[PDB]
Amino acid sequence: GSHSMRYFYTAMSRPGRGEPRFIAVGYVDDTQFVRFDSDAASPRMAPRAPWIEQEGPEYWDRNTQISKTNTQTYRESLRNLRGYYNQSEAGSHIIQRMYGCDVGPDGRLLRGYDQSAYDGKDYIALNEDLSSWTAADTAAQITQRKWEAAREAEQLRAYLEGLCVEWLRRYLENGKETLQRADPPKTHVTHHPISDHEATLRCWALGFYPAEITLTWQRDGEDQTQDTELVETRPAGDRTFQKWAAVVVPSGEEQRYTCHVQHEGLPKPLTLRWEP
């Protein structure tokens, strides 16, 4: 239905081990499609999905040029931030940035994002109005004043409402056979005895895309939220994802427990029981 494009920038200093490394990756929803790595032998924006390969030389040149410039600016910014916090030259530090757009099923912009973190902590974020900034501390206020004078917010707003949405529309059309194909999970329930009186029921979902899914156990129609172990959704390596939910039941009470599965690729939501 709805979709998103996000770019993720990480800039990492490594004192005594060369200049800071700059890595950029681009995603459409849960699919990576480009990457740039400043340590590469020949640094350039490079394809990571088939449907982006068809883009012309001016595309890869623009994306590589912007990324090369970013490599130097982020090196400047790490030096600046180290100063804002009176930090020494010995430690390694990390700027992270995420930005992009969400579009609804009509392809209209739902909202844009731009936000930054320093060493894992929120630093500065563009507000939802795409016009003002939230600075996290007095260091970030300096960055905010720099960006107001540079009209950063106006450039990002123009990008987020223009190129971001347009190219996302174009990416969704060119990769429509994968990006707009929802693969349903393969499901089943397993039974692992723990003792004479209890056993583990585990509800499995495999091979689904996109990663968004709902896996829940019920006891007598009642949700077992507190008592369900949920593993983090993990990638299979072939674009699809996996997940499981597990609950420990009194032996002999198994059939009071149901696993419920909602996913966009499912015709109908699923209800599964342990089948001995």
Binding site: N63, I66, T73, S77, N80, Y99, W147, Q155, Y159
Partner: peptide
Amino acid sequence: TVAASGHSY
């Protein structure tokens, strides 16, 4: 496609 290079922090 990437946004244009932004200003330094």
